[PDB]
Amino acid sequence: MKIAVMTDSTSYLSQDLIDKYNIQIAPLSVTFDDGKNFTESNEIAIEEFYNKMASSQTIPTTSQPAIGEWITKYEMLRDQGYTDIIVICLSSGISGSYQSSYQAGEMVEGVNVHAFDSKLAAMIEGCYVLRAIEMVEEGYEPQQIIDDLTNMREHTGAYLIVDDLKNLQKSGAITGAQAWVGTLLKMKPVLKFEDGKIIPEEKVRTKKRAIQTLEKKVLDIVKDFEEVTLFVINGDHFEDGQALYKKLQDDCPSAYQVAYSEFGPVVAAHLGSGGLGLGYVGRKIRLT
Ligand SMILES: CCCCCCCCCCCCCCCC(=O)O
Protein backbone atom coordinates (compact mmCIF):
# COMPACT_ATOMS: atom_id res chain seq x y z
CA MET A 1 0.00 0.00 0.00
CA LYS A 2 1.09 3.50 -1.02
CA ILE A 3 -1.72 6.09 -0.95
CA ALA A 4 -1.60 9.36 -2.90
CA VAL A 5 -4.01 12.29 -2.56
CA MET A 6 -4.74 14.64 -5.46
CA THR A 7 -7.42 17.10 -6.42
CA ASP A 8 -8.57 19.54 -9.07
CA SER A 9 -7.55 23.18 -9.21
CA THR A 10 -10.74 24.54 -7.61
CA SER A 11 -9.58 23.34 -4.16
CA TYR A 12 -7.44 26.55 -4.19
CA LEU A 13 -4.77 25.18 -1.88
CA SER A 14 -1.84 27.44 -1.13
CA GLN A 15 1.27 26.72 -3.17
CA ASP A 16 3.12 26.14 0.12
CA LEU A 17 0.82 23.18 0.83
CA ILE A 18 0.89 21.93 -2.78
CA ASP A 19 4.71 22.02 -2.59
CA LYS A 20 5.02 20.56 0.91
CA TYR A 21 2.87 17.49 0.29
CA ASN A 22 3.63 17.24 -3.48
CA ILE A 23 -0.08 17.42 -4.32
CA GLN A 24 -0.89 16.68 -7.93
CA ILE A 25 -3.53 18.93 -9.49
CA ALA A 26 -5.81 18.37 -12.47
CA PRO A 27 -6.53 21.93 -13.67
CA LEU A 28 -9.78 23.48 -14.81
CA SER A 29 -9.85 26.23 -17.44
CA VAL A 30 -11.70 29.45 -18.27
CA THR A 31 -12.48 30.95 -21.71
CA PHE A 32 -13.43 34.58 -22.43
CA ASP A 33 -15.66 35.96 -25.19
CA ASP A 34 -12.59 36.87 -27.30
CA GLY A 35 -11.48 33.22 -27.36
CA LYS A 36 -8.81 33.78 -24.69
CA ASN A 37 -8.31 30.65 -22.59
CA PHE A 38 -5.99 29.48 -19.83
CA THR A 39 -5.36 26.72 -17.30
CA GLU A 40 -5.92 27.38 -13.58
CA SER A 41 -2.68 27.84 -11.66
CA ASN A 42 -1.26 29.72 -8.70
CA GLU A 43 0.85 31.47 -11.37
CA ILE A 44 -2.22 33.39 -12.63
CA ALA A 45 -2.64 36.95 -11.34
CA ILE A 46 -6.17 37.05 -9.92
CA GLU A 47 -6.49 40.86 -10.07
CA GLU A 48 -5.94 40.80 -13.84
CA PHE A 49 -8.58 38.07 -14.21
CA TYR A 50 -11.21 40.26 -12.56
CA ASN A 51 -10.10 43.17 -14.76
CA LYS A 52 -10.59 41.04 -17.87
CA MET A 53 -13.98 39.87 -16.60
CA ALA A 54 -15.05 43.46 -16.03
CA SER A 55 -13.96 44.48 -19.55
CA SER A 56 -15.89 41.59 -21.16
CA GLN A 57 -19.26 42.16 -22.82
CA THR A 58 -20.03 38.44 -22.41
CA ILE A 59 -19.49 36.47 -19.20
CA PRO A 60 -16.64 33.94 -19.47
CA THR A 61 -17.20 30.20 -19.50
CA THR A 62 -15.24 27.45 -17.74
CA SER A 63 -14.33 23.84 -18.42
CA GLN A 64 -13.83 20.80 -16.27
CA PRO A 65 -10.52 18.96 -16.69
CA ALA A 66 -11.06 16.99 -19.89
CA ILE A 67 -11.47 13.27 -19.29
CA GLY A 68 -8.08 12.74 -20.93
CA GLU A 69 -6.52 15.23 -18.50
CA TRP A 70 -7.19 13.08 -15.41
CA ILE A 71 -6.04 9.90 -17.17
CA THR A 72 -2.64 11.48 -17.77
CA LYS A 73 -2.31 12.36 -14.08
CA TYR A 74 -3.30 8.94 -12.76
CA GLU A 75 -1.00 7.37 -15.36
CA MET A 76 1.68 9.78 -14.17
CA LEU A 77 0.93 8.76 -10.59
CA ARG A 78 0.67 5.06 -11.54
CA ASP A 79 4.09 5.21 -13.18
CA GLN A 80 5.44 6.69 -9.93
CA GLY A 81 4.36 3.52 -8.11
CA TYR A 82 1.42 4.48 -5.90
CA THR A 83 -1.16 1.76 -5.20
CA ASP A 84 -4.17 3.92 -4.26
CA ILE A 85 -5.14 7.48 -5.20
CA ILE A 86 -7.70 9.50 -3.23
CA VAL A 87 -9.13 12.18 -5.55
CA ILE A 88 -10.93 15.19 -4.06
CA CYS A 89 -13.21 16.88 -6.59
CA LEU A 90 -15.38 19.97 -7.01
CA SER A 91 -19.08 19.45 -6.28
CA SER A 92 -20.78 17.20 -8.79
CA GLY A 93 -23.77 19.57 -8.46
CA ILE A 94 -21.98 22.38 -10.32
CA SER A 95 -19.33 20.62 -12.43
CA GLY A 96 -18.44 17.54 -14.38
CA SER A 97 -14.98 17.41 -12.78
CA TYR A 98 -15.98 14.62 -10.35
CA GLN A 99 -17.52 12.32 -12.95
CA SER A 100 -14.61 12.86 -15.32
CA SER A 101 -12.26 11.93 -12.48
CA TYR A 102 -14.31 8.76 -11.83
CA GLN A 103 -14.52 7.81 -15.49
CA ALA A 104 -10.82 8.48 -16.03
CA GLY A 105 -10.06 6.29 -13.02
CA GLU A 106 -11.79 3.25 -14.50
CA MET A 107 -9.42 3.59 -17.46
CA VAL A 108 -5.95 3.41 -15.84
CA GLU A 109 -4.85 -0.12 -15.02
CA GLY A 110 -2.61 -0.99 -12.12
CA VAL A 111 -3.86 1.63 -9.65
CA ASN A 112 -7.01 1.92 -7.58
CA VAL A 113 -8.70 5.33 -7.86
CA HIS A 114 -11.08 6.56 -5.14
CA ALA A 115 -12.86 9.66 -6.39
CA PHE A 116 -14.61 11.73 -3.75
CA ASP A 117 -17.33 14.32 -4.41
CA SER A 118 -16.66 17.15 -1.95
CA LYS A 119 -20.09 18.70 -2.75
CA LEU A 120 -18.41 22.10 -2.31
CA ALA A 121 -15.61 24.20 -3.79
CA ALA A 122 -12.58 26.41 -3.05
CA MET A 123 -10.70 25.90 0.18
CA ILE A 124 -13.67 24.07 1.72
CA GLU A 125 -13.04 21.46 -0.98
CA GLY A 126 -9.35 21.90 -0.09
CA CYS A 127 -10.02 20.89 3.52
CA TYR A 128 -10.90 17.38 2.35
CA VAL A 129 -7.49 17.17 0.65
CA LEU A 130 -5.74 18.21 3.87
CA ARG A 131 -7.83 15.77 5.90
CA ALA A 132 -7.04 12.92 3.51
CA ILE A 133 -3.29 13.61 3.59
CA GLU A 134 -3.32 13.70 7.40
CA MET A 135 -5.05 10.32 7.54
CA VAL A 136 -2.60 8.74 5.08
CA GLU A 137 0.28 9.79 7.36
CA GLU A 138 -1.67 8.27 10.25
CA GLY A 139 -1.71 4.84 8.59
CA TYR A 140 -5.35 4.74 7.54
CA GLU A 141 -6.49 2.62 4.59
CA PRO A 142 -8.35 4.12 1.60
CA GLN A 143 -11.86 2.99 2.58
CA GLN A 144 -11.35 4.38 6.08
CA ILE A 145 -10.34 7.71 4.54
CA ILE A 146 -13.34 7.85 2.21
CA ASP A 147 -15.62 6.97 5.14
CA ASP A 148 -14.08 9.71 7.28
CA LEU A 149 -14.44 12.29 4.48
CA THR A 150 -18.06 11.25 4.00
CA ASN A 151 -18.68 11.87 7.71
CA MET A 152 -16.90 15.22 7.43
CA ARG A 153 -19.18 16.17 4.53
CA GLU A 154 -22.18 15.76 6.87
CA HIS A 155 -20.87 18.69 8.94
CA THR A 156 -19.53 20.96 6.17
CA GLY A 157 -21.27 23.81 4.45
CA ALA A 158 -21.07 27.35 3.15
CA TYR A 159 -23.07 30.53 2.67
CA LEU A 160 -22.18 33.11 0.04
CA ILE A 161 -23.03 36.49 -1.43
CA VAL A 162 -22.35 38.08 -4.83
CA ASP A 163 -22.78 41.60 -6.20
CA ASP A 164 -25.03 40.50 -9.07
CA LEU A 165 -26.69 37.18 -9.77
CA LYS A 166 -26.05 37.46 -13.54
CA ASN A 167 -22.88 35.32 -13.70
CA LEU A 168 -24.38 32.52 -11.61
CA GLN A 169 -27.64 32.85 -13.55
CA LYS A 170 -26.25 32.92 -17.10
CA SER A 171 -23.76 30.14 -16.36
CA GLY A 172 -26.49 27.87 -14.95
CA ALA A 173 -24.73 27.62 -11.59
CA ILE A 174 -27.64 28.67 -9.33
CA THR A 175 -30.63 26.43 -8.62
CA GLY A 176 -34.14 27.48 -7.65
CA ALA A 177 -33.61 31.18 -8.46
CA GLN A 178 -36.08 31.40 -11.38
CA ALA A 179 -38.27 33.72 -9.28
CA TRP A 180 -35.47 35.95 -7.93
CA VAL A 181 -35.08 37.21 -11.52
CA GLY A 182 -36.60 40.48 -12.71
CA THR A 183 -34.44 43.22 -11.19
CA LEU A 184 -34.01 41.42 -7.86
CA LEU A 185 -35.42 44.27 -5.72
CA LYS A 186 -31.94 45.61 -4.83
CA MET A 187 -31.88 43.45 -1.66
CA LYS A 188 -28.65 41.44 -1.60
CA PRO A 189 -29.02 37.70 -2.33
CA VAL A 190 -27.67 35.36 0.34
CA LEU A 191 -27.06 31.89 -1.06
CA LYS A 192 -25.99 28.60 0.45
CA PHE A 193 -24.77 25.20 -0.61
CA GLU A 194 -27.28 22.37 -0.23
CA ASP A 195 -26.43 18.80 -1.27
CA GLY A 196 -23.76 20.15 -3.64
CA LYS A 197 -26.00 22.77 -5.32
CA ILE A 198 -26.24 26.55 -4.78
CA ILE A 199 -29.71 27.71 -3.71
CA PRO A 200 -31.26 30.96 -2.45
CA GLU A 201 -31.44 31.34 1.29
CA GLU A 202 -32.56 34.86 2.13
CA LYS A 203 -32.81 38.36 0.71
CA VAL A 204 -31.44 41.17 2.89
CA ARG A 205 -31.67 44.90 2.30
CA THR A 206 -27.94 45.76 2.31
CA LYS A 207 -24.57 44.22 1.65
CA LYS A 208 -23.33 45.00 5.16
CA ARG A 209 -26.37 43.16 6.53
CA ALA A 210 -25.71 40.31 4.10
CA ILE A 211 -22.25 39.96 5.66
CA GLN A 212 -23.77 40.01 9.14
CA THR A 213 -26.23 37.34 7.99
CA LEU A 214 -23.34 35.19 6.73
CA GLU A 215 -21.78 35.34 10.19
CA LYS A 216 -25.02 34.71 12.07
CA LYS A 217 -26.08 31.70 10.00
CA VAL A 218 -22.73 29.93 10.23
CA LEU A 219 -22.10 30.68 13.93
CA ASP A 220 -25.54 29.24 14.81
CA ILE A 221 -24.67 26.00 13.01
CA VAL A 222 -21.11 25.49 14.25
CA LYS A 223 -21.91 26.17 17.91
CA ASP A 224 -23.09 22.55 18.04
CA PHE A 225 -19.87 21.04 16.67
CA GLU A 226 -17.09 19.54 18.78
CA GLU A 227 -14.45 20.99 16.40
CA VAL A 228 -14.75 24.01 14.09
CA THR A 229 -12.77 25.36 11.14
CA LEU A 230 -14.15 28.48 9.43
CA PHE A 231 -12.97 29.89 6.10
CA VAL A 232 -13.63 33.41 4.90
CA ILE A 233 -13.20 33.14 1.14
CA ASN A 234 -13.09 36.54 -0.51
CA GLY A 235 -13.57 37.73 -4.07
CA ASP A 236 -12.24 40.99 -5.52
CA HIS A 237 -13.54 43.45 -2.87
CA PHE A 238 -10.71 43.41 -0.33
CA GLU A 239 -12.51 45.22 2.50
CA ASP A 240 -15.45 42.78 2.25
CA GLY A 241 -13.38 39.79 3.29
CA GLN A 242 -11.17 41.74 5.69
CA ALA A 243 -14.24 43.01 7.54
CA LEU A 244 -15.77 39.54 7.85
CA TYR A 245 -12.47 37.94 8.88
CA LYS A 246 -11.80 40.63 11.52
CA LYS A 247 -15.35 40.26 12.89
CA LEU A 248 -15.00 36.48 13.20
CA GLN A 249 -11.64 36.85 14.95
CA ASP A 250 -13.34 39.09 17.51
CA ASP A 251 -16.58 37.13 17.94
CA CYS A 252 -15.25 33.61 17.90
CA PRO A 253 -13.36 31.87 20.68
CA SER A 254 -9.83 30.85 19.87
CA ALA A 255 -11.04 27.24 20.01
CA TYR A 256 -12.43 27.88 16.50
CA GLN A 257 -9.92 27.81 13.66
CA VAL A 258 -10.60 30.88 11.49
CA ALA A 259 -8.81 31.08 8.14
CA TYR A 260 -8.84 33.23 5.01
CA SER A 261 -8.63 32.31 1.34
CA GLU A 262 -9.72 33.69 -2.04
CA PHE A 263 -11.56 32.51 -5.13
CA GLY A 264 -9.56 31.62 -8.21
CA PRO A 265 -10.70 32.39 -11.75
CA VAL A 266 -12.91 29.33 -12.36
CA VAL A 267 -15.11 30.03 -9.36
CA ALA A 268 -14.80 33.80 -9.84
CA ALA A 269 -16.02 33.50 -13.45
CA HIS A 270 -19.33 32.16 -12.11
CA LEU A 271 -19.63 34.52 -9.13
CA GLY A 272 -18.68 37.76 -10.82
CA SER A 273 -17.43 40.69 -8.80
CA GLY A 274 -18.02 41.01 -5.07
CA GLY A 275 -18.10 37.31 -4.22
CA LEU A 276 -17.73 36.45 -0.56
CA GLY A 277 -18.16 33.06 1.10
CA LEU A 278 -18.15 31.85 4.67
CA GLY A 279 -17.64 28.12 4.87
CA TYR A 280 -17.35 25.74 7.79
CA VAL A 281 -16.11 22.24 8.62
CA GLY A 282 -16.89 20.40 11.86
CA ARG A 283 -13.26 19.32 12.15
CA LYS A 284 -9.96 20.87 13.23
CA ILE A 285 -8.30 20.65 9.81
CA ARG A 286 -4.49 20.68 9.66
CA LEU A 287 -3.70 23.87 7.74
CA THR A 288 0.10 23.56 7.85
C1 LIG B 1 -16.86 29.44 1.53
C2 LIG B 1 -17.03 28.56 0.27
C3 LIG B 1 -17.67 29.36 -0.86
C4 LIG B 1 -17.85 28.50 -2.11
C5 LIG B 1 -18.48 29.24 -3.30
C6 LIG B 1 -18.41 28.41 -4.59
C7 LIG B 1 -19.10 29.09 -5.76
C8 LIG B 1 -19.23 28.16 -6.97
C9 LIG B 1 -19.78 28.90 -8.21
C10 LIG B 1 -20.01 27.92 -9.38
C11 LIG B 1 -18.70 27.45 -10.01
C12 LIG B 1 -18.87 26.39 -11.14
C13 LIG B 1 -17.54 25.92 -11.69
C14 LIG B 1 -17.72 24.83 -12.78
C15 LIG B 1 -16.44 24.49 -13.51
C16 LIG B 1 -16.66 23.60 -14.80
O1 LIG B 1 -16.76 22.35 -14.56
O2 LIG B 1 -16.73 24.22 -15.91
Numbering used by the authors: 1 to 288
Verbatim from the authors:
Staphylococcus aureus FakB1 is a prototypical bacterial FA transfer protein that binds palmitate within a narrow, buried tunnel. Here, we use a combination of X-ray crystallography, NMR spectroscopy, MD simulations, site-directed mutagenesis, and functional biochemical assays to characterize the membrane-bound conformation of FakB. This study focuses on FakB1, an FA transfer protein from S. aureus that binds palmitic acid (16:0) before presenting it to FakA for phosphorylation and exchange with the membrane. The bacterial class of FA transfer proteins is called FakB, and the bound acyl chains are completely enclosed within the protein interior. The open conformation arises from a conformational change in the dynamic region that rotates helix α8 outward to uncover the FA-binding tunnel and reorganizes the adjacent α8-β9 loop into a new amphipathic helix.
The rotation of the dynamic Arg173 residue away from the protein is predicted to expose and promote the opening of a portal to the buried FA. We determined the X-ray structure of FakB1(R173A) to determine if this was the case, but its overall structure was identical to that of FakB1 (RMSD = 0.210 Å). The hydrophobic interface and the Ser171-His270 interaction are apparently sufficient to maintain the connection between the dynamic region and the body of FakB1 even though the absence of Arg173 does expose the first eight carbons of the FA to solvent as predicted. FakB1(R173A) is a few degrees less stable than FakB1 consistent with the loss of the hydrogen bond connection to Ile94, and as expected, FakB1(R173A) was catalytically inactive. Although the removal of Arg173 is not sufficient to generate the open conformation in the crystal lattice, its disengagement is essential for the conformation change to occur. We propose that Arg173 acts as a molecular latch that must be opened to allow the exit of the FA from the closed conformation. Arg173 covers the bound FA and provides a key hydrogen bond connection with the body of the protein.
